Design a protein around this ligand. Structure first.
Ligand SMILES: COc1c(/C=C/C(=O)c2ccc(O)cc2)ccc(O)c1O
Ligand SMILES: COc1c(/C=C\C(=O)c2ccc(O)cc2)ccc(O)c1O
Ligand SMILES: N[C@@H](CCC(=O)N[C@@H](CS)C(=O)NCC(=O)O)C(=O)O
Ligand SMILES: [Zn+2]
Ligand SMILES: [Zn+2]
Lengths: 175, 175
């Protein structure tokens, strides 16, 4: 029947002082077509592109998306890499050059065999008003807010099929 | 050849004001055995368990891990859920009850065919000292910091085999 609260807490250790400056900086997803991914994350979800890195020998690019004010992004390049990579809660999109032209190619979202990664999730002030807008924009849904057993929580998908949870923190208690 | 900077930026839109309070709240990974996972993320990586939710008819639990001070966690149950689910940069582990006792079951890390998800990543003050400690604690490595081409960057594995990048934002520019 799973762990009890107390049993779970018994498995948790206090943070060693050597970890006290650590932060959860990024979640990396591979994307077939960065043009479509950038449009989605910025126009649909309101993220900002904060950094782009290109590796021509390895034939890939990295795009770092975050909820940050574009006016805070440093102008000077070294400062800009160090700032972008010290922001909490970034999304790192990895583009292996040439996938966008390969009709047979797609990435796997983790929610079918083989399962592992599930989703990123965005906390919004109002899941219903968010989802109405997503519907107006033609966003793909896995689960509408009222569909299924978990009313008031939604799942959409990005251009690659990755699932994104849309959740309201302030309603999850009174729900 | 991958996108030019100009081409990438032209795919980006400004944040619609409907999205102005959105935040990247969680990354969700499925875990075989929450006992080992809680021990890893708290003892090894210095995260705090901030919330745990159980669903006894659906037979799964959710564990929310973050770099937060345990003294900040609200005492009142409903306030704690609202606080936990409005923290940026949480890691949500999902445990389907029973997997820990099924020797034919395991999750996929996304880095072998079919690929998709890559890794989460932790920013640290000192990759090499962090990794020396990891080695002392018997952590499994995908890439030690001096291995391979990108010297000074590491990848460890959690108990499920998910990859965790260990990076120092200040050393990433100069390299
Ligand atoms: C998993 O993500 C969530 C969920 C749960 C939603 C799920 O997608 C889910 C994952 C595994 C499973 O076996 C059943 C359902 C519920 C509340 C919440 O806040 C949250 O973030
Ligand atoms: C994909 O994540 C990155 C990379 C990108 C990838 C790698 O450097 C890499 C090296 C060895 C390996 O086994 C797997 C991947 C480079 C810089 C950076 O900051 C970052 O976050
Ligand atoms: N809370 C559920 C909701 C997801 C859902 O409704 N699942 C279906 C709806 S599209 C799905 O993933 N595919 C199987 C189906 O169509 O029955 C979750 O864990 O994501
Ligand atoms: Zn990375
Ligand atoms: Zn979730």
């Amino acid at each position: 029947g799973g762990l009890t609260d107390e049993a779970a807490l018994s498995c948790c250790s206090d943070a060693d002082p050597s970890t006290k400056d650590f932060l959860l900086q990024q979640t990396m997803l591979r994307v077939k077509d960065p043009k479509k991914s950038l449009d989605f994350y910025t126009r649909v979800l309101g993220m900002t592109l904060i950094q782009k890195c290109d590796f021509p020998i390895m034939k890939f690019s990295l795009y770092f998306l975050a909820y940050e004010d574009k006016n805070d992004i440093p102008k000077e390049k070294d400062e800009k890499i160090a700032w972008a990579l010290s922001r909490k809660a970034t999304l790192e999109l990895t583009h292996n050059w040439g996938t966008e032209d390969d009709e047979t190619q797609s990435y796997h979202n983790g929610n079918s065999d083989p399962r592992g990664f599930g989703h990123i999730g965005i906390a919004v002030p109002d899941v219903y008003s968010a989802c109405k807008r997503f519907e107006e924009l033609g966003v793909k849904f896995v689960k509408k807010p009222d569909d299924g057993k978990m009313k008031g929580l939604a799942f959409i998908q990005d251009p690659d099929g990755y699932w994104i949870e849309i959740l309201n923190p302030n309603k999850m208690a009174t729900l």
